[PDB]
Copies of this chain bind each other. A is one copy, B any other.
Amino acid sequence: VHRLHVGDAREVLASFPEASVHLVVTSPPYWTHIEDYEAFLDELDRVWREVFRLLVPGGRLVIVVGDVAVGRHLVFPLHADIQVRCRKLGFDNLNPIIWHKHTPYEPGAIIKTEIEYILMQRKPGGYRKPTQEQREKSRLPKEDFHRFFRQIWDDIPGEAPFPLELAERLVRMFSFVGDVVLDPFAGTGTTLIAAARWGRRALGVELVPRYAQLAKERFAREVPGFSLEVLD
């Protein structure tokens, strides 16, 4: 069963049992000055805390984030702030994957944004123990393994906060068939769709019911033989 709870991330996640989630793949809902920014980071931190609790040891929180290029030109280093703040919550920082989304002549030109960061935060506490059939059914072909486990992805074009294929790739790399993959800010549920298409159990949370309904519809359309259960 794949389910998408409609409501408040923090609240809903607070209602789940500790050590029940294996992988979290998500994109912060930024669309939703210094003070507003700091405030937003504070809200995110709350959700990250529930994630840390919900994550089984060795599980990880994967956050795809692009920095926000908002009286002059400047960019809010969202990915850096999220990274730093995750440390304070107990996460072990792992190397990020750079998503190469978009692939005068005088000094000082602005370099246009081409990337987004795939942040990786791991809950310490020992490795993972999968069943033999999980290992066999989750092993990646040599080809894919080398295409997936590199620090830069320049083969998945921009345009939901991220393509289905990018989520699918993350799912296959940091979870085993049968694991529970969670997305706190599900939107039209691309992470949910990615999990289910690959034999993982999908768990999500979305604030906007209109979106959750789109998620259900999109899920049914892209996950053959399955349905997403929306819990209002």
Chain A residues within CB distance 8 Å of chain B: 34, 58, 67, 69, 72-77, 79-81, 83-84, 87, 92-95, 97-98, 100, 104-115, 122, 124, 127-128, 135, 138-142, 145, 149-152, 172-176
Contact = CB atoms under 8 A, between A and B. Distances in A.
B140 A106 contact: yes
Contacts of A113: 95, 151
Most buried by B among A98, A106, A142: A106
A92 to B, nearest CB: 4
B111 A128 contact: no
A93 B111 CA distance: 12
A69 B95 contact: yes
Contact of A105 (B69, B72, B108, B141): B141
Q: Top 3 nearest A-B pairs by Cβ distance?
A: A80-B80, A114-B151, A80-B83
A34 B84 CA distance: 12
A175 B109 CA distance: 11
B95 A152 contact: no
A135 B128 CA distance: 59
A98 B74 CA distance: 18
A181 to B, nearest CB: 12
A130 to B, nearest CB: 8
B79 A109 contact: no
B77 A107 contact: no
